[PDB]
Write a protein that holds these residues in place. Structure first.
Motif, PDB file in Angstrom:
ATOM      1  N   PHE A  90     -39.795  10.889  -5.468  1.00 32.39           N
ATOM      2  CA  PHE A  90     -40.298  12.023  -4.708  1.00 32.39           C
ATOM      3  C   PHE A  90     -39.431  12.190  -3.462  1.00 32.39           C
ATOM      4  N   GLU A  91     -39.325  13.430  -2.976  1.00 32.15           N
ATOM      5  CA  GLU A  91     -38.407  13.799  -1.914  1.00 32.15           C
ATOM      6  C   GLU A  91     -39.165  14.647  -0.900  1.00 32.15           C
ATOM      7  N   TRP A  92     -38.945  14.369   0.385  1.00 36.32           N
ATOM      8  CA  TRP A  92     -39.375  15.228   1.472  1.00 36.32           C
ATOM      9  C   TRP A  92     -38.144  15.765   2.191  1.00 36.32           C
ATOM     10  N   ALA A  96     -38.761  18.959  11.233  1.00 39.06           N
ATOM     11  CA  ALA A  96     -38.911  18.120  12.405  1.00 39.06           C
ATOM     12  C   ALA A  96     -39.330  16.720  11.967  1.00 39.06           C
ATOM     13  N   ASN A  97     -38.410  15.752  12.101  1.00 37.81           N
ATOM     14  CA  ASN A  97     -38.606  14.426  11.534  1.00 37.81           C
ATOM     15  C   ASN A  97     -39.349  13.535  12.537  1.00 37.81           C
ATOM     16  N   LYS A 140     -33.582  13.382   7.848  1.00 38.73           N
ATOM     17  CA  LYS A 140     -34.033  14.748   7.613  1.00 38.73           C
ATOM     18  C   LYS A 140     -34.409  14.977   6.148  1.00 38.73           C
ATOM     19  N   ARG A 141     -33.944  14.088   5.268  1.00 40.28           N
ATOM     20  CA  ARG A 141     -34.375  14.071   3.880  1.00 40.28           C
ATOM     21  C   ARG A 141     -34.560  12.618   3.462  1.00 40.28           C
ATOM     22  N   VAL A 142     -35.644  12.348   2.720  1.00 38.74           N
ATOM     23  CA  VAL A 142     -35.954  11.012   2.223  1.00 38.74           C
ATOM     24  C   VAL A 142     -36.333  11.105   0.746  1.00 38.74           C
ATOM     25  N   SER A 143     -36.010  10.023   0.018  1.00 41.44           N
ATOM     26  CA  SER A 143     -36.357   9.803  -1.376  1.00 41.44           C
ATOM     27  C   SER A 143     -37.250   8.567  -1.480  1.00 41.44           C
TER      28      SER A 143
END
Ligand SMILES: [Cu+2]
Ligand SMILES: [Zn+2]
Ligand SMILES: [Zn+2]
Ligand SMILES: [Zn+2]
Ligand SMILES: [Zn+2]
Ligand SMILES: [Zn+2]
Length: 180
Positions: A90-92, A96-97, A140-143
């Protein structure tokens, strides 16, 4: 502020995400989402699901005034993304982190009712995936690597991002299908 996405290695976009962005490799979008269509990153509500948090029937909107349409629920209302049991990513994406406490991922109970408003009674309230945030700012993006339990047919996954320095969380439901 952020949403579940499928830009790099995410398996399935959030319901709200598809109000603005077309579905990876099919083109589908959700329609009639209301004002949240301009800002999918904004599905924020009170902490504490499932003991407190957003009330039954307002889980998908997080009680947001811009996202009330998300609380509609029939077997045909929303775009369903394919998934399988076992390992999935899953990815976000964050606009605004914020400092993060954790992410948790709920799945529906196998014989949930897809034509009634989402409630606690619809979900297995033991999360199937918990990722520690360590009270720091994510990139800014996570898996997130998760093991998805086995299911049949249409199911909903609730992804909760619990922000470390407030008393709010971001709630993204994901409409998934475990059969074609
Ligand atoms: Cu924010
Ligand atoms: Zn806004
Ligand atoms: Zn919190
Ligand atoms: Zn906030
Ligand atoms: Zn089947
Ligand atoms: Zn089957």
């Amino acid at each position: 502020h952020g949403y579940v996405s499928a830009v790099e290695n995410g398996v399935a976009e959030g319901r709200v995400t598809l109000c603005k962005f077309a579905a990876n490799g099919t083109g589908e979008k959700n329609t009639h989402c209301g004002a949240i269509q301009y800002e999918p990153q904004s599905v924020e509500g009170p902490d504490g699901f499932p003991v407190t948090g957003p009330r039954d029937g307002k889980i998908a909107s997080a009680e947001s005034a811009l996202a009330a349409a998300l609380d509609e629920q029939t077997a045909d209302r929303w775009v369903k993304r394919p998934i399988q049991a076992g390992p999935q990513t899953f990815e976000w994406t964050f606009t605004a982190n914020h400092v993060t406490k954790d992410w948790k991922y709920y799945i529906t109970k196998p014989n949930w009712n897809p034509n009634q408003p989402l409630s606690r009674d619809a979900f297995d309230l033991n999360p199937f995936c918990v990722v520690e945030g360590n009270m720091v700012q994510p990139p800014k993006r996570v898996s997130h690597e998760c093991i998805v339990p086995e299911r049949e047919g249409y199911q909903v996954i609730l992804a909760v991002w619990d922000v470390g320095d407030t008393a709010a969380s971001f709630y993204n439901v994901i409409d998934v299908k475990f059969d074609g």
